[PDB]
């Protein structure tokens, strides 16, 4: 599967993209959406919520499965992708683009060290 070289990743099959203001945009990977199948619901976090790294904060549900989506870093949820409430299949068709799930302002920069680069995420995929 497609593993964009510029992104960061979690072992739970999330990606993170740093934006110009320093916030991160978070979604699930091409591999993740492929395994879940045809998406029917994305339960979004509350804007303004404070989360710790590893907290469950969204859910992706398909016709066959559902999975928790974890905060990859600690911080405040600053935006959510409201389009997924009516078009959850964007997660399937454009997991790195229109299928983004939420944006987070990180509270502890040190946590970024626990994130994977693209090479490590590819290796992880090759390791299932």
PDB file of C-alpha atoms in Angstrom:
ATOM      1  CA  UNK A   1       0.000   0.000   0.000  1.00  0.00           C
ATOM      2  CA  UNK A   2       0.781   3.706  -0.494  1.00  0.00           C
ATOM      3  CA  UNK A   3       2.976   5.107   2.306  1.00  0.00           C
ATOM      4  CA  UNK A   4       3.659   8.772   1.511  1.00  0.00           C
ATOM      5  CA  UNK A   5       7.280   9.526   2.285  1.00  0.00           C
ATOM      6  CA  UNK A   6       6.601  12.907   3.843  1.00  0.00           C
ATOM      7  CA  UNK A   7       4.216  11.815   6.604  1.00  0.00           C
ATOM      8  CA  UNK A   8       4.709  10.474  10.108  1.00  0.00           C
ATOM      9  CA  UNK A   9       2.910   7.324  11.255  1.00  0.00           C
ATOM     10  CA  UNK A  10       1.778   5.442  14.323  1.00  0.00           C
ATOM     11  CA  UNK A  11       1.895   1.681  14.945  1.00  0.00           C
ATOM     12  CA  UNK A  12      -1.896   1.862  15.038  1.00  0.00           C
ATOM     13  CA  UNK A  13      -1.999   2.811  11.328  1.00  0.00           C
ATOM     14  CA  UNK A  14      -2.556   6.519  11.667  1.00  0.00           C
ATOM     15  CA  UNK A  15      -0.675   9.228   9.810  1.00  0.00           C
ATOM     16  CA  UNK A  16       0.214  12.734  10.902  1.00  0.00           C
ATOM     17  CA  UNK A  17       1.017  15.757   8.759  1.00  0.00           C
ATOM     18  CA  UNK A  18       2.494  18.940  10.216  1.00  0.00           C
ATOM     19  CA  UNK A  19       0.732  22.106   9.031  1.00  0.00           C
ATOM     20  CA  UNK A  20       2.246  25.570   8.577  1.00  0.00           C
ATOM     21  CA  UNK A  21       1.112  26.760  12.024  1.00  0.00           C
ATOM     22  CA  UNK A  22       2.548  23.663  13.687  1.00  0.00           C
ATOM     23  CA  UNK A  23      -0.723  21.787  14.244  1.00  0.00           C
ATOM     24  CA  UNK A  24      -0.991  18.196  13.013  1.00  0.00           C
ATOM     25  CA  UNK A  25      -3.613  16.717  10.751  1.00  0.00           C
ATOM     26  CA  UNK A  26      -4.384  13.062  11.515  1.00  0.00           C
ATOM     27  CA  UNK A  27      -6.050  10.309   9.501  1.00  0.00           C
ATOM     28  CA  UNK A  28      -5.734   6.590   8.850  1.00  0.00           C
ATOM     29  CA  UNK A  29      -3.475   5.005   6.261  1.00  0.00           C
ATOM     30  CA  UNK A  30      -4.266   3.410   2.909  1.00  0.00           C
ATOM     31  CA  UNK A  31      -3.525   0.050   4.530  1.00  0.00           C
ATOM     32  CA  UNK A  32      -5.934   0.756   7.366  1.00  0.00           C
ATOM     33  CA  UNK A  33      -8.838   1.721   5.133  1.00  0.00           C
ATOM     34  CA  UNK A  34      -8.230  -1.281   2.903  1.00  0.00           C
ATOM     35  CA  UNK A  35      -8.469  -3.637   5.872  1.00  0.00           C
ATOM     36  CA  UNK A  36     -11.602  -1.999   7.256  1.00  0.00           C
ATOM     37  CA  UNK A  37     -13.448  -1.968   3.930  1.00  0.00           C
ATOM     38  CA  UNK A  38     -16.326   0.263   2.829  1.00  0.00           C
ATOM     39  CA  UNK A  39     -16.718   2.971   5.428  1.00  0.00           C
ATOM     40  CA  UNK A  40     -20.171   3.785   6.834  1.00  0.00           C
ATOM     41  CA  UNK A  41     -19.514   5.908   9.899  1.00  0.00           C
ATOM     42  CA  UNK A  42     -16.752   7.994  11.455  1.00  0.00           C
ATOM     43  CA  UNK A  43     -17.356   9.091  15.049  1.00  0.00           C
ATOM     44  CA  UNK A  44     -15.501  12.399  15.417  1.00  0.00           C
ATOM     45  CA  UNK A  45     -13.967  13.866  18.572  1.00  0.00           C
ATOM     46  CA  UNK A  46     -15.240  17.079  20.138  1.00  0.00           C
ATOM     47  CA  UNK A  47     -13.496  20.270  19.061  1.00  0.00           C
ATOM     48  CA  UNK A  48     -11.737  21.644  22.145  1.00  0.00           C
ATOM     49  CA  UNK A  49     -11.240  18.241  23.748  1.00  0.00           C
ATOM     50  CA  UNK A  50      -7.950  17.571  25.503  1.00  0.00           C
ATOM     51  CA  UNK A  51      -6.433  14.166  24.905  1.00  0.00           C
ATOM     52  CA  UNK A  52      -3.341  12.230  25.974  1.00  0.00           C
ATOM     53  CA  UNK A  53      -1.288  10.215  23.526  1.00  0.00           C
ATOM     54  CA  UNK A  54      -2.960   6.800  23.130  1.00  0.00           C
ATOM     55  CA  UNK A  55      -6.440   7.970  24.170  1.00  0.00           C
ATOM     56  CA  UNK A  56      -9.203   6.658  21.909  1.00  0.00           C
ATOM     57  CA  UNK A  57     -10.698   9.744  20.314  1.00  0.00           C
ATOM     58  CA  UNK A  58     -12.413   8.678  17.060  1.00  0.00           C
ATOM     59  CA  UNK A  59     -13.976   5.509  15.643  1.00  0.00           C
ATOM     60  CA  UNK A  60     -14.014   4.308  12.043  1.00  0.00           C
ATOM     61  CA  UNK A  61     -16.762   1.819  11.170  1.00  0.00           C
ATOM     62  CA  UNK A  62     -17.201  -0.073   7.924  1.00  0.00           C
ATOM     63  CA  UNK A  63     -19.749  -2.561   6.700  1.00  0.00           C
ATOM     64  CA  UNK A  64     -17.699  -5.343   8.346  1.00  0.00           C
ATOM     65  CA  UNK A  65     -15.593  -3.906  11.159  1.00  0.00           C
ATOM     66  CA  UNK A  66     -14.922  -1.019  13.471  1.00  0.00           C
ATOM     67  CA  UNK A  67     -11.774   0.308  15.017  1.00  0.00           C
ATOM     68  CA  UNK A  68     -10.754   2.851  17.572  1.00  0.00           C
ATOM     69  CA  UNK A  69      -8.600   5.716  16.347  1.00  0.00           C
ATOM     70  CA  UNK A  70      -6.087   6.905  18.927  1.00  0.00           C
ATOM     71  CA  UNK A  71      -4.549  10.309  19.592  1.00  0.00           C
ATOM     72  CA  UNK A  72      -1.008   9.819  18.314  1.00  0.00           C
ATOM     73  CA  UNK A  73       0.232  12.679  20.520  1.00  0.00           C
ATOM     74  CA  UNK A  74      -1.166  14.581  23.511  1.00  0.00           C
ATOM     75  CA  UNK A  75      -2.918  17.862  22.854  1.00  0.00           C
ATOM     76  CA  UNK A  76      -6.129  19.712  22.036  1.00  0.00           C
ATOM     77  CA  UNK A  77      -8.453  18.768  19.181  1.00  0.00           C
ATOM     78  CA  UNK A  78      -8.714  21.952  17.125  1.00  0.00           C
ATOM     79  CA  UNK A  79     -10.791  20.761  14.129  1.00  0.00           C
ATOM     80  CA  UNK A  80     -12.661  17.720  12.854  1.00  0.00           C
ATOM     81  CA  UNK A  81     -13.605  16.685   9.362  1.00  0.00           C
ATOM     82  CA  UNK A  82     -17.362  17.253   9.378  1.00  0.00           C
ATOM     83  CA  UNK A  83     -17.606  16.075   5.789  1.00  0.00           C
ATOM     84  CA  UNK A  84     -17.091  12.509   7.061  1.00  0.00           C
ATOM     85  CA  UNK A  85     -20.456  12.680   8.822  1.00  0.00           C
ATOM     86  CA  UNK A  86     -22.213  12.492   5.434  1.00  0.00           C
ATOM     87  CA  UNK A  87     -19.364  11.069   3.266  1.00  0.00           C
ATOM     88  CA  UNK A  88     -17.383   8.611   5.423  1.00  0.00           C
ATOM     89  CA  UNK A  89     -16.206   6.859   2.265  1.00  0.00           C
ATOM     90  CA  UNK A  90     -13.706   9.711   1.768  1.00  0.00           C
ATOM     91  CA  UNK A  91     -11.574   7.710   4.185  1.00  0.00           C
ATOM     92  CA  UNK A  92     -11.490   4.897   1.589  1.00  0.00           C
ATOM     93  CA  UNK A  93     -11.014   6.980  -1.560  1.00  0.00           C
ATOM     94  CA  UNK A  94      -8.642   9.630  -0.182  1.00  0.00           C
ATOM     95  CA  UNK A  95      -7.254   8.543   3.163  1.00  0.00           C
ATOM     96  CA  UNK A  96      -4.372  11.077   3.007  1.00  0.00           C
ATOM     97  CA  UNK A  97      -6.373  13.981   1.550  1.00  0.00           C
ATOM     98  CA  UNK A  98     -10.122  14.582   1.885  1.00  0.00           C
ATOM     99  CA  UNK A  99     -10.335  11.654   4.298  1.00  0.00           C
ATOM    100  CA  UNK A 100      -8.412  13.398   7.100  1.00  0.00           C
ATOM    101  CA  UNK A 101     -10.166  12.914  10.435  1.00  0.00           C
ATOM    102  CA  UNK A 102      -9.032  15.540  12.965  1.00  0.00           C
ATOM    103  CA  UNK A 103      -6.417  18.176  13.721  1.00  0.00           C
ATOM    104  CA  UNK A 104      -4.521  18.395  16.976  1.00  0.00           C
ATOM    105  CA  UNK A 105      -2.357  21.003  18.639  1.00  0.00           C
ATOM    106  CA  UNK A 106       0.375  19.030  20.356  1.00  0.00           C
ATOM    107  CA  UNK A 107       1.055  19.781  24.048  1.00  0.00           C
ATOM    108  CA  UNK A 108       4.384  17.888  24.378  1.00  0.00           C
ATOM    109  CA  UNK A 109       6.842  18.032  21.494  1.00  0.00           C
ATOM    110  CA  UNK A 110       8.917  15.223  22.985  1.00  0.00           C
ATOM    111  CA  UNK A 111       6.182  12.719  22.107  1.00  0.00           C
ATOM    112  CA  UNK A 112       6.945  13.193  18.416  1.00  0.00           C
ATOM    113  CA  UNK A 113       9.917  10.884  18.985  1.00  0.00           C
ATOM    114  CA  UNK A 114       7.588   7.890  19.363  1.00  0.00           C
ATOM    115  CA  UNK A 115       6.284   8.453  15.803  1.00  0.00           C
ATOM    116  CA  UNK A 116       7.425   6.352  12.814  1.00  0.00           C
ATOM    117  CA  UNK A 117       8.751   7.621   9.566  1.00  0.00           C
ATOM    118  CA  UNK A 118       7.625   6.186   6.256  1.00  0.00           C
ATOM    119  CA  UNK A 119      10.443   3.642   6.111  1.00  0.00           C
ATOM    120  CA  UNK A 120       9.591   2.343   9.571  1.00  0.00           C
ATOM    121  CA  UNK A 121       5.881   2.159   8.679  1.00  0.00           C
ATOM    122  CA  UNK A 122       6.652   0.188   5.508  1.00  0.00           C
ATOM    123  CA  UNK A 123       8.775  -2.186   7.596  1.00  0.00           C
ATOM    124  CA  UNK A 124       5.902  -2.592  10.065  1.00  0.00           C
ATOM    125  CA  UNK A 125       3.580  -3.504   7.157  1.00  0.00           C
ATOM    126  CA  UNK A 126       6.135  -6.002   5.897  1.00  0.00           C
ATOM    127  CA  UNK A 127       6.139  -7.427   9.415  1.00  0.00           C
ATOM    128  CA  UNK A 128       2.513  -8.578   9.551  1.00  0.00           C
TER     129      UNK A 128
END
